Design a protein around this motif. Structure first.
Motif, PDB file in Angstrom:
ATOM      1  N   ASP B 135      -1.121 -29.878 -19.464  1.00 44.61           N
ATOM      2  CA  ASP B 135      -2.068 -28.852 -19.902  1.00 44.61           C
ATOM      3  C   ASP B 135      -1.473 -28.038 -21.053  1.00 44.61           C
ATOM      4  O   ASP B 135      -0.407 -27.448 -20.869  1.00 44.61           O
ATOM      5  CB  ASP B 135      -2.395 -27.921 -18.702  1.00 44.61           C
ATOM      6  CG  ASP B 135      -3.479 -26.879 -19.022  1.00 44.61           C
ATOM      7  OD1 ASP B 135      -3.690 -26.514 -20.214  1.00 44.61           O
ATOM      8  OD2 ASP B 135      -4.114 -26.278 -18.086  1.00 44.61           O
ATOM      9  N   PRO B 136      -2.110 -27.984 -22.233  1.00 45.32           N
ATOM     10  CA  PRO B 136      -1.597 -27.187 -23.360  1.00 45.32           C
ATOM     11  C   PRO B 136      -1.225 -25.762 -22.976  1.00 45.32           C
ATOM     12  O   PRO B 136      -0.332 -25.157 -23.609  1.00 45.32           O
ATOM     13  CB  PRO B 136      -2.774 -27.185 -24.360  1.00 45.32           C
ATOM     14  CG  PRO B 136      -3.419 -28.517 -24.128  1.00 45.32           C
ATOM     15  CD  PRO B 136      -3.350 -28.705 -22.593  1.00 45.32           C
ATOM     16  N   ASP B 137      -1.915 -25.197 -21.993  1.00 43.39           N
ATOM     17  CA  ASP B 137      -1.706 -23.791 -21.640  1.00 43.39           C
ATOM     18  C   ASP B 137      -0.518 -23.553 -20.701  1.00 43.39           C
ATOM     19  O   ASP B 137      -0.204 -22.366 -20.455  1.00 43.39           O
ATOM     20  CB  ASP B 137      -2.956 -23.239 -20.978  1.00 43.39           C
ATOM     21  CG  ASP B 137      -4.156 -23.244 -21.917  1.00 43.39           C
ATOM     22  OD1 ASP B 137      -3.948 -22.972 -23.121  1.00 43.39           O
ATOM     23  OD2 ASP B 137      -5.286 -23.463 -21.436  1.00 43.39           O
ATOM     24  N   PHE B 138       0.138 -24.597 -20.189  1.00 41.73           N
ATOM     25  CA  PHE B 138       1.361 -24.358 -19.409  1.00 41.73           C
ATOM     26  C   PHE B 138       2.393 -23.514 -20.166  1.00 41.73           C
ATOM     27  O   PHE B 138       2.625 -23.699 -21.370  1.00 41.73           O
ATOM     28  CB  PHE B 138       1.968 -25.713 -19.003  1.00 41.73           C
ATOM     29  CG  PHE B 138       3.291 -25.530 -18.290  1.00 41.73           C
ATOM     30  CD1 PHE B 138       3.307 -25.206 -16.925  1.00 41.73           C
ATOM     31  CD2 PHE B 138       4.508 -25.697 -18.964  1.00 41.73           C
ATOM     32  CE1 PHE B 138       4.513 -25.032 -16.311  1.00 41.73           C
ATOM     33  CE2 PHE B 138       5.732 -25.510 -18.335  1.00 41.73           C
ATOM     34  CZ  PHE B 138       5.731 -25.186 -16.969  1.00 41.73           C
ATOM     35  N   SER B 139       2.995 -22.547 -19.451  1.00 43.86           N
ATOM     36  CA  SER B 139       4.037 -21.707 -20.027  1.00 43.86           C
ATOM     37  C   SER B 139       5.197 -21.607 -19.059  1.00 43.86           C
ATOM     38  O   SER B 139       5.001 -21.162 -17.933  1.00 43.86           O
ATOM     39  CB  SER B 139       3.485 -20.296 -20.298  1.00 43.86           C
ATOM     40  OG  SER B 139       4.489 -19.429 -20.749  1.00 43.86           O
ATOM     41  N   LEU B 140       6.395 -22.018 -19.481  1.00 39.79           N
ATOM     42  CA  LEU B 140       7.524 -22.020 -18.556  1.00 39.79           C
ATOM     43  C   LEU B 140       7.772 -20.631 -17.980  1.00 39.79           C
ATOM     44  O   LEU B 140       8.071 -20.492 -16.788  1.00 39.79           O
ATOM     45  CB  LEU B 140       8.766 -22.550 -19.258  1.00 39.79           C
ATOM     46  CG  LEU B 140      10.017 -22.627 -18.373  1.00 39.79           C
ATOM     47  CD1 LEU B 140       9.732 -23.419 -17.059  1.00 39.79           C
ATOM     48  CD2 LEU B 140      11.179 -23.256 -19.223  1.00 39.79           C
ATOM     49  N   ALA B 141       7.610 -19.594 -18.807  1.00 38.95           N
ATOM     50  CA  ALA B 141       7.856 -18.239 -18.318  1.00 38.95           C
ATOM     51  C   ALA B 141       6.915 -17.824 -17.193  1.00 38.95           C
ATOM     52  O   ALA B 141       7.234 -16.866 -16.462  1.00 38.95           O
ATOM     53  CB  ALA B 141       7.766 -17.281 -19.489  1.00 38.95           C
ATOM     54  N   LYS B 142       5.745 -18.470 -17.063  1.00 35.93           N
ATOM     55  CA  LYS B 142       4.772 -18.118 -16.029  1.00 35.93           C
ATOM     56  C   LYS B 142       5.007 -18.867 -14.718  1.00 35.93           C
ATOM     57  O   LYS B 142       4.231 -18.692 -13.757  1.00 35.93           O
ATOM     58  CB  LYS B 142       3.340 -18.404 -16.480  1.00 35.93           C
ATOM     59  CG  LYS B 142       2.836 -17.312 -17.463  1.00 35.93           C
ATOM     60  CD  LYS B 142       1.425 -17.624 -18.024  1.00 35.93           C
ATOM     61  CE  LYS B 142       0.331 -17.716 -16.908  1.00 35.93           C
ATOM     62  NZ  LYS B 142      -1.058 -18.186 -17.424  1.00 35.93           N
TER      63      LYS B 142
END
Lengths: 234, 234
Positions: B135-142
């Motif tokens: 998913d393009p919206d994945f963010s490791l910080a989240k």
């Protein structure tokens, strides 16, 4: 946190970790050499549980690079080295050597015997080796391990042992090829390396493991286990 | 039997498989090209569900040779090929192309665009692409994906997308590296390959998944999902 989350992400990993820490016991104050350390995250848990010093070794350059970067980010004091363990010189005299998924990657009994001698050359006279490896008695005809996330594709007589190719339940699928050396040949390697004491350790399947899965789920795990623990002492 | 067992051996794999079959629909009588086929076992399940013809492609000849041997032992009619998909010539005109964990291994937007054109060149005008990717919206910080068996170690800018190294929860640990391209880059790749229709598909997390894990287990999966489905049609 992270170690619990990862350890619980796979039913069999929870049994593996519980069995390895049963074999290890109290690690407070001990020096530990983790001989197939991966990215270091088992070693980080050993450190968290009170080890005085933890050194990890793995064959892969790029993985040891990543291990060192993880320790920098966490601020932990682990030390890492790339080595071909069967052919390495000693790194020091440790209270404990941990070897999870080391010995089944020896591709000959000669290399298996060398690894056990390397372990002994790295241990204090009152130290111990804790290992996790393939149970010599596993037989593919008696049941595949796919319920437990390892699809063993084949079993090939390979000199005095057997070679297996397997598919792991990863995204995308990944391949691992490993060796199932006999109990005789393990015990010969153990004794010739100077370990006058050893014991094989069955994986610690427990009541809670069974409750959270349907009837019959752990049958092949119990009747035809792929894994075994092993503890050796001089 | 085997497909069920392996699919249930990892919580996320069950959601992935459910979501992919939801996107695919009825496969009865269809020809299917599985463009990142692994050892062929998803293809074998698509065949069991009624596909007329299943052809698998992947990048590793060692894997494809093992796939072919599995088909010989099971007696199924799957056919396999080793290809660099971004540069491959057409293999035929299929009703369905399935592409699980293909596009996140394109190491540039140019290669991502080429892959989509190769898919179109493999599809009947009334066919469709079903895909599973990052998913393009994945963010490791989240939130990391370690509960779901994927320890994402890092996140770095990589041209117009991001690159991630990750540890899979396997025995031993295994490494791999993948790419998170933007939603706009995907959509431009889709449209310029001649797909005038697309839809992104959220992974189908269901009540029974939630009820069979501890409270909060799926929070990061729901709020910061690493995976997405995608369907495209000419």
């Amino acid at each position: 946190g992270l170690f619990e989350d990862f350890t619980q992400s796979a039913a069999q990993r929870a049994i593996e970790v519980r069995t390895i820490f049963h074999m290890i016991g109290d690690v407070s104050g001990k020096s530990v050499l983790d001989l197939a350390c991966g990215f270091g995250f088992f070693g980080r848990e050993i450190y968290r549980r009170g080890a005085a010093k933890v050194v990890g070794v793995d064959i892969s350059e790029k993985m040891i690079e990543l291990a060192r970067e993880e320790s920098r980010k966490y601020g932990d004091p682990l030390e890492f080295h790339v080595r071909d363990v069967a052919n390495m010189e000693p790194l020091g005299q440790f209270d404990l050597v941990n070897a999870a998924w080391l010995f089944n990657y020896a591709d000959s009994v000669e290399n298996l015997r060398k690894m056990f001698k390397v372990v002994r050359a790295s241990l204090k006279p009152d130290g111990k080796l804790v290992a996790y490896t393939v149970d010599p008695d596993f037989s593919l005809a008696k049941g595949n391990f796919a319920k437990y996330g390892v699809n063993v594709l084949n079993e090939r007589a390979w000199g005095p042992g057997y070679r297996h190719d397997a598919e792991f339940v990863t995204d995308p699928p990944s391949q691992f090829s490993f060796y199932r050396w006999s109990r005789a040949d393990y015990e010969s390697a153990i004794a010739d390396a100077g370990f006058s004491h050893f014991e094989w350790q069955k994986p610690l399947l427990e009541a809670d493991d069974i409750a959270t899965h349907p009837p019959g789920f752990w049958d092949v795990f119990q009747n035809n286990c792929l894994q075994t623990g092993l503890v050796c002492k001089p």
